[PDB]
């Protein structure tokens, strides 16, 4: 056997990101496993995952006790895999509802062709092909074309009258057709009515209700209504043919996300495990899918099947938004569940909650105290805090006897290290459980050692309510055994401190190259002039003035 | 985690990030928002931007077009969470050297 | 001069910021539940990752600041080293 050449390249970066929607066939092509079972956990001795289920270990492990199946690893070295679920009846989308109710007015419902003229279509596509097209310019073009297409109710290609398209309920589309006026009699509507008069021989309660009989567009007919549209009228419909397509707008194949994206919680009060709400909704959708199949072979009424179809379409519709208004009272759920849209929206979200926040470690916060015994760029750090914080550094030829003495001292004494990392083997070892006299001997070039904070290190010191750019600064660290923060009173004006109840915080840079960037730009001696006016902000305090 | 009783850290918001941007230091900003916050290695294909595994794609079925990048866990989290909204984020890898 | 270079007097609002910048990701925090997010997938526009906020969200070194210029290493190197002959393949010996 021979190994195939496989090497990764680092000199690459993302330039552009194009948005687009996938189609069910590409969804299955990307998917790995297909769930068929609704049971989450198998009925065996101990808690074990069920194959071809919602909680399967083929999409990614979530704990420190079971390895992965696709590629043998842990959940730390694991990205995630997706799955595909086949749906018996196609469902509507909650975000692509306005798009489809607009397209239904754009194209016909019996011809699948745009309602425009040959000369106006050319004038519009001429405005389409331009070297400069912003996203705000295409927002108004769709509305400009929609009214022009809705003004005319009869197409020029064929001779059929469409009508209008309106929504009703929550997910229901009725095509306003077969209008009955009192000026002209139409042969189409008369034939439509007389074709229903033969069905009044069994039930006498359908003739007065016949005037409200119209076309009710269901996902089934809309599916082939989207598959009969010519691909040549797609660019003028403001729809990128490369990314999107008129067809893949109806949910037919559900994409199962990885299991590592939905962790489970356990409470140690009554032995209670609780899965993610996403998993509960997925396993509830599966239970709604087989009752329709079994009802088919068993045989139910048309209303009994339409109710289950609507329930299956509504349960997947509340899985993403879960905030849709105007729902039936009998179908209104009592419990409150958060979906994908609610994972996005909210103060405790992921856009401005995790990405913008991104809280960091290796920091602290303590009440400040006055101490006019240091310089302008100095700050006192307590011994208890300096023992917790650690700075990693690689051992050079000149840093051999400087780190060997530190590791000989130990972590109990202030000058010393806690964690030792090897050169080749990427593993960290404690200095409290192991020996220190032997670790100093076994030391080679290129070893990472995390030592305690000593005097002469660039540390960051700032307050929480920052207004200007001078609210954060970098000073030199100094160890002082008093369990309090101390700094000169001259730099109290940039921080706007009151020295009565203020709580100021402190950060320690980890990368050595970034340690030099905070010393030249975020320097106390350098930053003495303010950018707004140009006057020195650090002069004196009222006591020194007096 | 949040809170001092659970042995948690401090939060760095935009209030202080604007002050770091005004100075002009970018290495320190990425060191204490990406290096000491969340550092993850992710493999991406250049032909069709998607998340693979062990340098192997499942859409194009090819091992030639493959590369690796350092992306914070929050960004990959959002990228894998946005795929359930019928949205496929396709990245375009460009040569930084050339 | 920032609201006078492109067109007329543009205001710093939610609508004028969409006319100034053309990034959907930064507007994702300003706008609401899913409108822009679904219209982006519907239209299918390409977002260019060249904004400082985009560089902080993604994790790319920003352009402004210390990332504008590029460094260069200096050492001993030869632009074009002497090549090695190809004794067999010679055009005069082939007569094609």
């Amino acid at each position: 056997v021979k190994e195939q050449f496989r090497e990764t390249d680092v000199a690459k970066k993302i330039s552009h990101i194009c948005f687009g929607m996938k189609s069910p066939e590409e969804m299955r092509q990307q998917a790995h496993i297909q769930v068929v079972s609704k049971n989450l956990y198998s009925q065996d001795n101990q808690h074990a995952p069920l194959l071809y289920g919602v909680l399967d270990h083929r999409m990614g492990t979530s704990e420190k006790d079971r390895p992965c199946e696709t590629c043998g690893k842990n959940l730390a070295d694991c990205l995630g895999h997706y799955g595909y679920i086949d749906l018996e009846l196609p469902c509507f989308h909650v975000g692509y509802f306005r798009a489809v109710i607009g397209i239904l007015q754009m194209i016909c419902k019996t011809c699948c062709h745009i309602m425009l003229s040959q000369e106006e279509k050319k004038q519009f596509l001429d405005y389409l092909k331009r070297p400069g097209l912003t996203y705000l310019q295409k927002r108004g073009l769709k509305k400009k074309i929609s009214d022009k297409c809705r003004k005319k109710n009869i197409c020029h290609h064929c001779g059929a009258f469409n009508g209008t398209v309106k929504k009703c309920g929550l997910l229901k589309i009725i095509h306003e057709k077969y209008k009955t006026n009192k000026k002209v009699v139409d042969p189409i509507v008369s034939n439509f009515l007389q074709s229903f008069e033969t069905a009044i021989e069994h039930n006498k309660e359908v003739e007065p209700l016949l005037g409200r009989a119209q076309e009710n567009l269901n996902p089934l007919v809309v599916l082939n209504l989207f598959k009969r549209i010519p691909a040549e009228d797609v660019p003028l419909l403001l729809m990128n043919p490369e990314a999107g397509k008129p067809s893949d707008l109806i949910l037919t194949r559900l994409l199962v996300p990885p299991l590592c994206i939905r962790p489970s919680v356990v409470s140690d009060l009554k032995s209670g495990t609780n899965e993610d709400d996403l998993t509960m909704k997925l396993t509830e959708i599966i239970f709604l899918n087989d009752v329709i199949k079994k009802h088919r072979i068993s045989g139910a009424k048309t209303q009994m099947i339409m109710e289950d179809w609507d329930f299956l379409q509504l349960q997947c519709a509340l899985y993403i938004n879960s905030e849709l208004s105007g729902i039936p009272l009998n179908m209104a759920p009592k419990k409150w569940t958060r979906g994908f849209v609610q994972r996005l929206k909210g103060k405790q979200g992921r856009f401005r909650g995790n990405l913008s926040g991104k809280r960091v470690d290796f920091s602290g916060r303590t009440v400040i105290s006055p101490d006019p015994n240091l310089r302008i760029d100095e700050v006192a750090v307590p011994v208890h805090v300096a023992k917790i914080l650690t700075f990693p550094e690689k051992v050079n030829k000149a840093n051999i006897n400087f780190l060997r003495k530190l590791v000989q001292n130990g972590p109990e004494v202030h000058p010393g290290a806690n964690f030792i990392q090897q050169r080749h083997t990427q593993m960290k070892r404690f200095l409290k459980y192991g020996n220190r006299e032997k670790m100093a001997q076994e030391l080679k070039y290129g070893d990472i050692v995390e030592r305690h904070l000593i005097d002469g290190d660039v540390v960051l010191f700032n307050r929480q309510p920052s207004l200007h750019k001078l609210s954060i600064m970098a000073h030199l660290a100094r160890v002082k055994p008093h369990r309090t923060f101390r700094f000169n009173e001259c730099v109290c004006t940039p921080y706007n401190a009151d020295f009565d109840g203020d709580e100021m915080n402190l950060h320690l840079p980890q990368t050595e190259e970034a340690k030099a960037e905070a010393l030249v730009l975020m320097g106390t001696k350098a930053n003495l002039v303010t950018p707004r006016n140009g006057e020195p902000l650090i002069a004196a305090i009222q006591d020194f003035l007096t | 985690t949040e809170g001092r009783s659970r042995d948690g850290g401090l939060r760095l918001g935009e209030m202080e990030r604007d002050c770091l941007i005004g100075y002009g230091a970018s290495m320190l900003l990425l060191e204490r928002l990406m290096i000491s916050s969340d550092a993850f290695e992710v493999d991406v294909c250049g032909q069709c931007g998607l998340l693979g595994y062990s340098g192997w794609c499942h859409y194009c079925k090819s091992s030639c077009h493959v590369s690796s990048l350092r992306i914070p866990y929050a960004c990959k989290l959002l990228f894998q969470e946005l795929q359930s909204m019928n949205i496929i984020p396709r990245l375009k890898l460009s040569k930084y050297n050339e | 001069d920032l609201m006078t270079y492109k067109g007329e007097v543009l205001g710093i609002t939610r609508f004028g910021l969409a006319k100034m910048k053309e990034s959907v990701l930064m507007l994702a925090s300003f706008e609401k539940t899913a409108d822009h997010l679904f219209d982006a997938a519907y239209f299918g526009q390409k977002d260019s990752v060249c904004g400082v906020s985009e560089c902080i969200i993604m994790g790319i070194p920003m352009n402004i600041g210390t990332g504008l210029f590029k460094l260069l290493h200096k050492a001993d190197r030869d632009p074009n080293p002497p090549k090695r002959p190809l004794i067999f393949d010679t055009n005069e010996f082939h007569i094609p």
Binding site: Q464, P465, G501 | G13, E14 | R14
Partner: peptide, 30 residues
């Protein structure tokens, strides 16, 4: 341009949070 209100439209950020200390005495981790 619609007559909207800055408070209800723009959702409260860390900018709005007024960090001030008052006496107010009396999740899966791996």
């Amino acid at each position: 341009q619609e007559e909207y209100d800055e408070e209800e439209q723009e959702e409260e950020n860390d900018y709005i949070n007024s960090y001030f200390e008052d006496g107010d005495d009396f999740e899966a981790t791996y």
